[PDB]
C-alpha cells in the first residue's frame, strides 16, 4: 500500500465521514492561485500530517513519473497540492506531468503557480513558453519568454538556460 | 444446534423458538395460501417474513415433499408482492441491527428509512431536511454511516430494484451530507460558547439565535460563490444583531470553522481562500480602528 492510501484512510477513519476529501481534485483546483498572506490553516496542517509524510508522497507521485506513468503522477501531485498548495515543487512537477499528457491548458496553471510561489525562478516561465508555443500560439509565449530571460541572465546558477533563449532569439 | 438456531444465531429480530413455532403451525396439507397467511400473523416484519420462508423451505425434509412444493411457491408468492421491501429489507438486516444498537430506533426503522432514501433520487439537501425531522444532529452521522454502509452493499449485488449509476449519485450526496453535518456539529459546540462569553460581559443576544440558524448561515455564504465582506458582515448582523463583540464573535466563529469543518464543503480551493480573506476584511471593518 503507497504512503498516500494510508494517509487518505488514517484521516477518513478518524472523521466522521465515509470521504471527507472533493471528489473532483482537478476541479477543485481549477484557477486557484494560493496567497501566502491569507491567514488559513493547510489541511496538512489541520490533518496533522508530517512534512516526512508529504514527502514519501511526493516520491511516490516522482517515481511514477519516471516510469511514464503520467496519470498516477498527476493524481499523487493534485493530493499534494490539496494538503500543502505552498510547496512549489509540488506544482512544478504536476505541471510537467501535465506537459507530458499534453494537458496544456492546465500544465501552464501549475507552471504559473510555482513562479508565483518561486519568484528567482526563470524556468517555470520557460516551460510555459514552451507550452504557449504549442497552442499555435497564444502569443503569451514571447511574455513569458522574457519573464524568463529576466531571471536567467546575469546569474551563473541559470547560465544554461540563458544561452538557450539567446539561441531561441535569432 | 438445530437449523432454526442457525437462522437466528445473529439475528436480534427472532428466535430459533419463533422459526420453529411457525413451522409447527403449519401441516402438511397446508397450501401456499394457508402459508402465507401463518406467516403474516405470526412474523410481522416483511424482512423477517421474507427470512422465515428461507428458513421453512430449506429445512422441509424429504418426506414432507409437497409441503416443501407449497412453501416455494408461496415464497414466490411473497417476494412477487412485497419485493424490494422484503428483499431489499433484507439484504440489510444485520447491519440495521448493529447501527440500530447504536442508536434510540429500531432496526425496521432504519430499514424502512434506506428504503425510502434510495428508494427515489435525493439531493444532499434534502437527505438533510429528511433527517432533521426524525433524528438529533449527533444521531445524523450514524444514520449516514448506515446509510453508506447499506448502499455500498448496494453495488456489490448489483439488485434488480435500485440502479448502480443512481447508488453512486446517492453515495455521493450522502457524502456531502456528512460533511454538511460537520458543520451543525461544530456550532452545536461553539455558538453556546459564544453566547456564555457575550452574557459574561453583559451583552444581550437575540432570542431567535441558535445553533442551527448559524450554520445556515455559514452555508449561505460558502454557497456564496462571489463572497465579499460587505455580504459576510450583512449576514452575521442578521444573524446576531448589530454589537460589535457579538458580530465579531461570530465572523471569529465562522473563520474557525473554514479549518475545523469539512474540506468536501467547498467546491473550489480559490473560493475557501476567498471567503477566508473575507471574513478576516470584515473583522477589519468592523472594528475600530
Ligand atoms: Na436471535
Same mark, same amino acid.
Given at each position: 500500500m503507497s504512503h498516500l492510501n494510508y494517509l487518505l484512510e488514517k484521516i477518513a477513519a478518524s472523521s466522521k465521514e465515509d470521504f471527507p476529501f472533493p471528489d473532483d481534485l482537478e476541479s477543485y483546483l481549477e484557477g486557484y492561485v494560493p496567497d501566502k498572506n491569507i491567514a488559513l490553516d493547510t489541511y496538512q496542517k489541520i490533518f496533522k500530517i508530517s512534512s516526512e509524510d508529504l514527502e514519501k508522497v511526493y516520491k511516490e507521485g516522482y517515481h511514477a513519473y519516471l516510469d511514464k506513468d503520467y496519470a498516477k503522477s498527476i493524481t499523487v501531485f493534485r493530493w499534494l497540492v490539496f494538503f500543502n498548495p505552498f510547496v512549489s515543487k509540488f506544482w512544478f512537477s504536476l505541471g510537467a506531468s501535465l506537459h507530458m499528457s499534453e494537458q496544456y491548458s492546465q500544465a501552464l496553471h501549475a507552471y504559473g503557480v510555482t513562479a508565483v510561489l518561486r519568484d528567482k525562478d526563470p524556468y517555470p516561465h520557460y516551460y510555459a513558453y514552451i507550452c504557449y508555443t504549442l497552442?499555435? &500560439?497564444? &502569443? &503569451?509565449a514571447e511574455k513569458a519568454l522574457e519573464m524568463a530571460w529576466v531571471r536567467a541572465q546575469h546569474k551563473p546558477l541559470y547560465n544554461e538556460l540563458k544561452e538557450e533563449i539567446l539561441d531561441i532569439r535569432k | 444446534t438445530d437449523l432454526a438456531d442457525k437462522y437466528a444465531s445473529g439475528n436480534s429480530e427472532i428466535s430459533g423458538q419463533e422459526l420453529r413455532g411457525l413451522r409447527d403451525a403449519?401441516? =402438511? =396439507?397446508?397450501?401456499p395460501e394457508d402459508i402465507l397467511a401463518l406467516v403474516q400473523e405470526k412474523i410481522k416484519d416483511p424482512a423477517l417474513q421474507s427470512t422465515a420462508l428461507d428458513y421453512l423451505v430449506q429445512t422441509t @425434509? @424429504?418426506?414432507?415433499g409437497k409441503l416443501k412444493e407449497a412453501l416455494i411457491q408461496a415464497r414466490n408468492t411473497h417476494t412477487e408482492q412485497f419485493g424490494r421491501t422484503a428483499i431489499g429489507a433484507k439484504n440489510i438486516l444485520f447491519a440495521s441491527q448493529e447501527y440500530a444498537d447504536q442508536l434510540n430506533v429500531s432496526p425496521s426503522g432504519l430499514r424502512s428509512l434506506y428504503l425510502e432514501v434510495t428508494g427515489d433520487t435525493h439531493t444532499c439537501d434534502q437527505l438533510l431536511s429528511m433527517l432533521q425531522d426524525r433524528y438529533t444532529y449527533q444521531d445524523m452521522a450514524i444514520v449516514s454511516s448506515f446509510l453508506m454502509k447499506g448502499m455500498a452493499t448496494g453495488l456489490k449485488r448489483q439488485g434488480p430494484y435500485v440502479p448502480s449509476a443512481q447508488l453512486q449519485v446517492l453515495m455521493t450526496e450522502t457524502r456531502n451530507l456528512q460533511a454538511v453535518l460537520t458543520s451543525y456539529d461544530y456550532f452545536e459546540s461553539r455558538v453556546p460558547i459564544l453566547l456564555d462569553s457575550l452574557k459574561a460581559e453583559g451583552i444581550q443576544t437575540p432570542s431567535d439565535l441558535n445553533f442551527v440558524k448559524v450554520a445556515e448561515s455559514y452555508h449561505k455564504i460558502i454557497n456564496d460563490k462571489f463572497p465579499t465582506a460587505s455580504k459576510v458582515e450583512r449576514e452575521v448582523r442578521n444573524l446576531i444583531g448589530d454589537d460589535v463583540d457579538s458580530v465579531t464573535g461570530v465572523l471569529n466563529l465562522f473563520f474557525s470553522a473554514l479549518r475545523q469543518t469539512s474540506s468536501r464543503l467547498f467546491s473550489s480551493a480559490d473560493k475557501r481562500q476567498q471567503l477566508g480573506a473575507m471574513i478576516a476584511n470584515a473583522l477589519d471593518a468592523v472594528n475600530i480602528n
Amino acid at each position: 500500500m503507497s504512503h498516500l492510501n494510508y494517509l487518505l484512510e488514517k484521516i477518513a477513519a478518524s472523521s466522521k465521514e465515509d470521504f471527507p476529501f472533493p471528489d473532483d481534485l482537478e476541479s477543485y483546483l481549477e484557477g486557484y492561485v494560493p496567497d501566502k498572506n491569507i491567514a488559513l490553516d493547510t489541511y496538512q496542517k489541520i490533518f496533522k500530517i508530517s512534512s516526512e509524510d508529504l514527502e514519501k508522497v511526493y516520491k511516490e507521485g516522482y517515481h511514477a513519473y519516471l516510469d511514464k506513468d503520467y496519470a498516477k503522477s498527476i493524481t499523487v501531485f493534485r493530493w499534494l497540492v490539496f494538503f500543502n498548495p505552498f510547496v512549489s515543487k509540488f506544482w512544478f512537477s504536476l505541471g510537467a506531468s501535465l506537459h507530458m499528457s499534453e494537458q496544456y491548458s492546465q500544465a501552464l496553471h501549475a507552471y504559473g503557480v510555482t513562479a508565483v510561489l518561486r519568484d528567482k525562478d526563470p524556468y517555470p516561465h520557460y516551460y510555459a513558453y514552451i507550452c504557449y508555443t504549442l497552442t499555435n &500560439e497564444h &502569443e &503569451e509565449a514571447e511574455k513569458a519568454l522574457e519573464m524568463a530571460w529576466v531571471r536567467a541572465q546575469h546569474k551563473p546558477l541559470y547560465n544554461e538556460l540563458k544561452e538557450e533563449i539567446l539561441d531561441i532569439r535569432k | 444446534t438445530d437449523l432454526a438456531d442457525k437462522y437466528a444465531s445473529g439475528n436480534s429480530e427472532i428466535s430459533g423458538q419463533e422459526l420453529r413455532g411457525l413451522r409447527d403451525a403449519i401441516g =402438511d =396439507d397446508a397450501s401456499p395460501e394457508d402459508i402465507l397467511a401463518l406467516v403474516q400473523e405470526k412474523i410481522k416484519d416483511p424482512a423477517l417474513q421474507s427470512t422465515a420462508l428461507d428458513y421453512l423451505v430449506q429445512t422441509t @425434509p @424429504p418426506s414432507q415433499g409437497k409441503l416443501k412444493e407449497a412453501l416455494i411457491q408461496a415464497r414466490n408468492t411473497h417476494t412477487e408482492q412485497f419485493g424490494r421491501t422484503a428483499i431489499g429489507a433484507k439484504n440489510i438486516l444485520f447491519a440495521s441491527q448493529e447501527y440500530a444498537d447504536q442508536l434510540n430506533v429500531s432496526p425496521s426503522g432504519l430499514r424502512s428509512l434506506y428504503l425510502e432514501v434510495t428508494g427515489d433520487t435525493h439531493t444532499c439537501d434534502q437527505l438533510l431536511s429528511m433527517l432533521q425531522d426524525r433524528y438529533t444532529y449527533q444521531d445524523m452521522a450514524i444514520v449516514s454511516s448506515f446509510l453508506m454502509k447499506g448502499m455500498a452493499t448496494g453495488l456489490k449485488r448489483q439488485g434488480p430494484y435500485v440502479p448502480s449509476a443512481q447508488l453512486q449519485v446517492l453515495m455521493t450526496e450522502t457524502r456531502n451530507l456528512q460533511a454538511v453535518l460537520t458543520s451543525y456539529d461544530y456550532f452545536e459546540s461553539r455558538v453556546p460558547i459564544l453566547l456564555d462569553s457575550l452574557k459574561a460581559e453583559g451583552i444581550q443576544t437575540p432570542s431567535d439565535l441558535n445553533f442551527v440558524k448559524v450554520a445556515e448561515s455559514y452555508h449561505k455564504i460558502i454557497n456564496d460563490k462571489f463572497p465579499t465582506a460587505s455580504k459576510v458582515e450583512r449576514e452575521v448582523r442578521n444573524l446576531i444583531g448589530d454589537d460589535v463583540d457579538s458580530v465579531t464573535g461570530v465572523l471569529n466563529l465562522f473563520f474557525s470553522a473554514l479549518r475545523q469543518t469539512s474540506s468536501r464543503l467547498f467546491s473550489s480551493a480559490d473560493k475557501r481562500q476567498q471567503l477566508g480573506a473575507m471574513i478576516a476584511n470584515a473583522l477589519d471593518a468592523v472594528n475600530i480602528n
